[PDB]
């Protein structure tokens, strides 16, 4: 009929927490173009034993 078309707005502001805990298959499968392009200061500084 003519119910309220807006928020409560005193509705639940927290987690469900029974919401979906899995990984959505239809997520973003591409690389984020504006991701971290710098070198990682905390990375492997040693020498790979399996290197050529």
């Amino acid at each position: 009929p003519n119910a309220n078309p807006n928020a409560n707005p005193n509705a639940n502001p927290n987690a469900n927490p029974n919401a979906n805990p899995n990984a959505n298959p239809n997520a973003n499968p591409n690389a984020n173009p504006n991701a971290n392009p710098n070198a990682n200061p905390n990375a492997n500084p040693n020498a790979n034993p399996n290197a050529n």
Partner: antibody, heavy 123, light 107 residues
Amino acid sequence: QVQLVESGGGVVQPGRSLRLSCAASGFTFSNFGMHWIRQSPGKGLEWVAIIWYDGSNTYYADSVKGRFTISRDNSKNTLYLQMNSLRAEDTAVYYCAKVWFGESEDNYSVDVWGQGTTVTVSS
Amino acid sequence: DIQMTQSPSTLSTSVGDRVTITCRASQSISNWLAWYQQKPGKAPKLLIYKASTLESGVPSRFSGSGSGTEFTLTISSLQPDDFATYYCQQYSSYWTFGQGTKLEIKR
């Protein structure tokens, strides 16, 4: 086991330079990156510099960037830290430290620390 | 620059007590946190890495816990060799240490 021996510390006037060295034994030195970490009563533990196993990448703390230079001599198994333009707040005990061995995608820190050498910057 | 803070600064404890010290980061560091032990006039020694992995050679009475921004170190049964200063260190973005917690002998 792993052993690290620092040397070169002493009393230095402000503005002068000093070169610290760290002799490594008990492991393949050329296969590991190294850290220099300092400890002072006023600031506690404070990371100073890191160098890759081959020296290709080096990083420094902001308070020392542009003044300190970390290097290494894999033929001598020696780690070096050239400190220029020393200020009073650089007085501390300096340790060299060995990065631990881990997985390829992990982040890394140090597992074995050297004995430490004291540097006192005073006029 | 990630700030680290340890609580309490000093803890008076006795042999056989269960000791828990906390360490908090100003931002999320995931699980990249290490715990180091230092005895006076001696170099620090690594106890725990990855916030919960025990270093080889460390007795089993040490354990780590925590993730995100809050981490704790627990000693199930204190022994006289464990009276020392304990520092946490994030290694998620560069390296910063906490002020250190000194375990004091209660009398």
